[PDB]
């Protein structure tokens, strides 16, 4: 369908420890597949999906070298950022970067992404034209002038239309979704009331919608819910709950919408 | 395949 590749990079400045803590995580279709961490005993890029383990040794060698390049790029950029914001002392200075490419059925680049944040706030982003920059404040405007002078955008556009799309293509043949499994549990409360908790487990990607209904109609009652959370095995969990009268709970239905399902589920708690 | 940033720093 609409395939994608992302790399999520984080650098946290360090004092007289020269090198910042540098972490990079790569995703294919929103699923982790490679990882680099500078605080490893030997910092290396590593597979994080079984299907990446087939890549040749030179691939891991080339990638690890690029990570050491990034680490140095973030180190100098964090020193520059320190000066852009005058004093502003903190024991935490964080530069984050998101980049990657959305791939279409036609196999061309659909959307390219390159975005930076400093201290948890938008700093600078490449616009969708992959030629101009959006700068969030005075410091990011210094950076933008500098990158317009040196032609930085052309380097990033070339990666996004080229290498990014090309290796996304290859990964999608290497590892040639997972629909929710749902059920309802039943928790009696006091005074003739009971909680109906609709669970969705084992699904991927995280995006899901859970709704309780009475005969095709949504309930005016307020639905208690829980934010979608990782199970720890690559799948996610969610639940929505509702408080109904004891002896009436068979009439209520849970709906589960997820893209791994041709059609949304309908299920209920069935009494004996 | 990871992006190596353009050498001009922030």
């Amino acid at each position, epitope marked *: 369908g609409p395939h994608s590749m992302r790399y999520f990079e984080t650098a946290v400045s360090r004092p007289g420890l*020269e090198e910042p803590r540098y972490i990079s995580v790569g995703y294919v279709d929103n699923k982790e597949f490679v990882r680099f961490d500078s605080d490893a005993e030997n910092p290396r890029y590593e597979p994080r999906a079984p299907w990446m383990e087939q890549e040749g040794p030179e691939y891991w060698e080339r990638e690890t070298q*690029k990570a050491k*390049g990034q680490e*140095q*790029w973030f*180190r*100098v950029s964090l*020193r*520059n950022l320190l000066g852009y914001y005058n004093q502003s002392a903190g024991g935490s200075h964080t530069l984050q970067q998101m980049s990657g490419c959305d791939l279409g059925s036609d196999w061309r680049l659909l959307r390219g992404y390159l975005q930076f944040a400093y201290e948890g706030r938008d700093y600078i982003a490449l616009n969708e034209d992959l030629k101009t920059w959006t700068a969030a404040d005075m410091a990011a405007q210094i950076t933008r002038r*500098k990158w317009e*002078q*040196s*032609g*930085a955008a*052309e*380097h990033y556009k*070339a*990666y996004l239309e*080229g*290498e990014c799309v090309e290796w996304l293509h290859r990964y999608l043949k290497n590892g040639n979704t997972d629909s929710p499994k749902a059920h309802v549990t039943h928790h009696p409360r006091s005074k003739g009331e009971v909680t109906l908790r609709c669970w969705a487990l084992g699904f991927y990607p995280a995006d899901i919608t859970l709704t309780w209904q009475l005969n095709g109609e949504e309930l005016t009652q307020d639905m208690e819910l829980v934010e979608t959370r990782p199970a720890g095995d690559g799948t996610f969990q969610k639940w929505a709950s509702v408080v109904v009268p004891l002896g009436k709970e068979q009439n209520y239905t849970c709906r589960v919408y997820h893209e791994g399902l041709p059609e949304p589920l309908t299920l209920r708690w069935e009494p004996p | 395949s990871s992006l*190596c*940033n*353009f*050498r*001009a*720093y922030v």
Partner: T-cell receptor
Amino acid sequence: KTTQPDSMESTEGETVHLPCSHATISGNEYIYWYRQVPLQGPEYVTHGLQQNTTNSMAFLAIASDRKSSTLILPHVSLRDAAVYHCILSGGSNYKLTFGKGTLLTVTP
Amino acid sequence: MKVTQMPRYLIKRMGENVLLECGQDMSHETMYWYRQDPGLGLQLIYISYDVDSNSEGDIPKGYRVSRKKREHFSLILDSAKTNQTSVYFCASSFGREQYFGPGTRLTVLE
């Protein structure tokens, strides 16, 4: 690594074409041209990634497979005589490796 | 965009110290020290990525560098050898091209 001819001769006023071969170039590597008048400091001329490039002193053309290029010096003066270095420069890399380059002479 | 180098020419006795200085007032992050023997190529001695962030280039033996501020970069020959007779070029970069200084011709004599 790039390959250039050892030397090139022209008379002032002519258009000069300096060829450069770089068949093991990678997608992130720019093509940079520097010149050096002997015993003087080398001087940037131009560079490009794929899209052809025009500036005040020169034109650059890059083949569509990126495996060769040529520097174009429109109406050479005597002051353009120099060694011209074609050098690959990783977009993420600050180092350059200079070769022998092409010695351009221009006679009046 | 201007890189400064003094002196243009220098005579040193064999075994004496040598300090060559390079300046740039645009506060570029990266600076370089090259040497060029006549009729040969420019060879990188050391590159400085930032203050106290220096890496060996192709021919580091017999040299060391100091980068305490971004605006200067110094090349130090602790005990000059005759085969260090050469032309030394320093450079700087912001991320686009390199800007070269006018060079220093050092002659080391017995």
